[PDB]
Design a protein around this ligand. Structure first.
Ligand code: BR
Ligand code: BR
Ligand code: BR
Ligand code: BR
Lengths: 276, 276
């Protein structure tokens, strides 16, 4: 084996978004994103374009003619990301890529090998809804231990957008951009830095939701909580005593995980609270 | 009649682009763009999105279900432009609009009235390939004299993009844009005004082609040429004497029209040369 495998934890809700973070943060020249069903490919493919990613889908209602253009654009560099099923994937007409992402893990360890094999390069599995056992079953089937890796921090992501956004800027002919050298001039003059920020948002897709890492649900910030003889009821009574809103509490390694609101600020005596 | 009608000259090549110029320059809250065939609507609709315009098509392979969403998005303000045929247009389920554009003039003066009637508001006919007689036939059928109007200058257009682009900026929450207040800060600091211009190009679609106003062809700048006893052969011999490349020459009102190259600079003694 000559590729690195990674299991990235991602709830079944923020997944699409985790996918996008990873694409920006790795800057693969070519990616392939394997899902389960035909329906999901267009679903996912649409939302990556939506998220600034050059992506197109691939399912089985593809006629030979409208499958080849796809592949042409993909290899050349026009579409940097391809979203497919295990079926529309096979064929000697399929490029080599930098990254494979298992959006929905392989329904068997033969479909993992044919999926990942297409890459040395990099392979990433998305799991969240506590698919953890399904993951280590794959590892048993496959006989490999996928290194667990953290998804990119929001900060990591932004420097990535920016970085991509810059390289993209350096691609604009002087004729194109000189056309706007007046308006850009107007801005710098009047020091309209807020306006420029707005511009960036328009391109980089602005504010992400604060999502829980236990439920993929928004309006939550997942935490790590450890404390003396701290069991759920206690941890919970301590938080409710501070008049907080408590969501998904689950048991962690050396403590509990506990969603609190994105805004709430947690200082409970004796109890040690960090985000995850 | 309670709407203003205009005939805008536009070659059969730069037409799509003339369409876009007009949309930006008028800033209609809702537009409807009538074409001839079903195929053209998606053709045109696609290229307006491509050109920064919120547009969607409407043809006849529309099933009741996937026709209504369309109309919902249109009236509400989601899609600001609708591209249709004379058939998929009829129905009591069709909004009132600010602008109607006859991309391809009405094949009869009943279809002009049902087209335009849907607007007081504004009606615009596109003609170019010397459809001028077809135009004044319509006027005879309809019994009205459409005021001839110039298409917007490239400069007119740009202030329009910009203007739209600004109002669009004022719509971004402080949370979205503050997310980028660092990067925007980096720019102003280092005075990277070229970079900002690039950003604008990315959004505003950069350099337009220099197109001939006689052939809709690019690599030409159409002119107006008048001179003493100036006939074609002479006008042409004068230009070729100055070692120029001459394209479509046609006869104008009080002179000739003559494409020359976008770069060429024309000073021929006695002959009076302006662009159109
Ligand atoms: Br990679
Ligand atoms: Br409890
Ligand atoms: Br208007
Ligand atoms: Br001649």
């Amino acid at each position: 084996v000559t590729y690195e495998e990674e299991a990235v934890p991602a709830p079944v809700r923020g997944r699409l978004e985790v996918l996008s973070d990873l694409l920006y943060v790795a800057s693969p020249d070519r990616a392939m994103v394997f899902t389960r069903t035909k329906a999901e490919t267009e679903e996912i493919a649409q939302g990556l374009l939506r998220l600034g990613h050059p992506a197109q889908a691939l399912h089985g209602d593809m006629s030979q003619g409208e499958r080849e253009r796809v592949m042409g654009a993909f290899r050349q560099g026009e579409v940097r990301v391809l979203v497919a099923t295990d079926v529309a994937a096979r064929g000697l007409d399929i490029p080599q890529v930098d990254l494979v992402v298992h959006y929905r893990m392989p329904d068997r360890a033969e479909a993992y090998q044919h999926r990942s094999g297409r890459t040395g390069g990099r392979v990433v599995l998305l799991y969240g809804p506590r698919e953890r056992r399904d993951v280590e079953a794959l590892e048993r089937a496959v006989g490999r231990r996928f290194k667990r890796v953290n998804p990119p921090t929001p900060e990591e992501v932004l420097e990535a957008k920016w970085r991509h956004l810059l390289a993209r800027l350096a691609r604009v002919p002087e004729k194109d951009y000189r056309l706007y050298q007046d308006f850009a001039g107007r801005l710098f003059a009047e020091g309209r830095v807020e306006v420029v920020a707005a511009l960036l948002a328009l391109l980089l897709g602005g504010a992400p939701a604060e999502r829980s890492l236990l439920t993929g649900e928004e309006g939550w910030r997942t935490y790590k909580a450890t404390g003396p003889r701290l069991s759920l009821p206690r941890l919970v009574a301590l938080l409710k005593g501070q008049g907080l809103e408590v969501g998904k509490v689950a048991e962690a390694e050396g403590g509990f995980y506990v969603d609190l609101r994105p805004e709430a600020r947690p200082e409970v005596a004796g109890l040690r609270l960090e985000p995850a």
